[PDB]
Structures are given as C-alpha cells and as structure tokens.
C-alpha cells in the first residue's frame, strides 16, 4: 500500500515554485492553490519556526538530504502529519541560485 506523497520545488525562502499534481490526493489542494505561497503558510504554528530553520539549513548541507516532520493544514482545515525530505539542486554548468526539491509524504506520528 503506497504512502501518499507528492514532489514540490521551492525557492530558498520556502515559496512553492513547482507542485506535482499528486498533491490533490495527499493534501487536497490543486497545485495552483500552493504555487506562489510559502510552505510555512500551511504549517502548524508550533512547527513554523522549525520549518523556516529547516529551509535555512538545507542550503548549508552541501546538497545532502534534510528531513523535517510538521503538521500541514489540509484542504479540509485538518492538521496532517507530513514528513518532508528536502535537498538542494544547483546545475554545475551554471552559477544560478540553487533551489530546493522536496518530497512530502503523509506519515503517522507514533
């Protein structure tokens, strides 16, 4: 039985710049409801600073994976536990700013 998961890309600030349509089954939103918003806007107030600090560190970790668990507000206004695994990508043929790639899975907290 597959976990429910979807990919997103963010800028280093946390704003969704790409959202895989598997999000509709995972959290209920159409990709265009997430695009242009900061992931922290969907995050439980107790988890928002950890999520900001996580986006801040992933760029220091030399392209290695950083994981975070946090409560994400579904389209039904319910808090779902999400495990986001993130890493940076920067194309070495260029000097363009790195962006962050995330995989977002609904997980159990137990």
């Amino acid at each position: 039985c597959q976990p429910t998961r979807f990919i997103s890309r963010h800028n280093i600030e946390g704003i969704f710049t790409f959202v895989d349509h598997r999000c509709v089954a995972t959290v209920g939103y159409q990709p265009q409801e997430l695009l242009g918003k900061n992931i922290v806007e969907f995050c439980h107030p107790e988890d928002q600073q950890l999520l900001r600090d996580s986006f801040q560190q992933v760029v220091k970790l030399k392209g290695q994976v950083l994981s975070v668990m946090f409560r994400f507000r579904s389209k039904n206004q319910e808090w779902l536990w999400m495990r986001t695994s993130s890493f940076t990508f920067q194309n070495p043929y260029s000097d363009e700013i790195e962006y962050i790639i995330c995989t977002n899975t609904n997980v159990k907290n137990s």
């Binding site: 242009g36 918003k37 900061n38 922290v40 806007e41 107030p45 928002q48 507000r73 206004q77 808090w79």
Partner: protein, 109 residues
C-alpha cells in the same frame, strides 16, 4: 476597558499579502514588533479554521477593490489567538499595495 483608537492599528501589505508596514499599536494588542512582521504573509498568522474564509475574502478584495473581512483570529506572538475585523483597501497606481485597518475584538485567548 480600552478606547477605540487604542484597539485599532493600520497595516500595509504587498499584493502577495506580505507585511510591508505595521503601526506600533500592534505590540500592546498582539505582542508583535512591527519589524518582525515584515516580509511574512498574512496567511502565516490566520487560525486554520479561518484560512479558507480569508482566501475567499481576499478574492473579493481583488475583484471588488475594498472588502470588510468579518471576524477572524490572528496567532498572537506568544501563542493563542486574538479576534480581529479588518477593512482592506487596494491602492492601485498610474495594484500597488493593500491597506488594512485592523480592529481588535478580544484579548489573547
């Protein structure tokens, strides 16, 4: 008991909803220092149960140009929530920014 002016404060936002200015009155009322709000979207601060209603109110502000929010909760600096009603107005130029007149309906809960 507080007088009307003391429960009211103005804020300004970019069209992406991020704070670009907030009156210092917010500090006594909700705990935030204005400069800590700057660059963060309004959406970071709505209670979950108000979120969808605010999104709809925002659409209305963008289609109509002015809207009154009706009653919502802002996350307070040290946790809990304060109830607010806001009058929002879009300032358009030659949209440029959104001006919010915010009235506190409750203490931190």
């Amino acid at each position: 008991f507080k007088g009307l002016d003391s429960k009211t404060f103005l804020s300004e936002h970019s069209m992406d909803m991020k704070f670009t200015y907030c009156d210092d009155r917010i500090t006594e009322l909700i705990g935030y220092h204005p400069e800590e709000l700057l660059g963060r979207s309004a959406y970071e601060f709505y209670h979950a149960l108000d979120s969808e209603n605010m999104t709809k109110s925002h659409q209305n502000l963008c289609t109509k140009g002015q809207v009154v929010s009706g009653q919502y909760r802002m996350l307070a600096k040290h946790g809990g929530y304060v109830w607010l009603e806001t009058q929002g107005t879009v300032i358009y130029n030659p949209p440029q920014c959104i001006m919010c007149v915010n009235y506190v309906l409750s203490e931190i809960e």
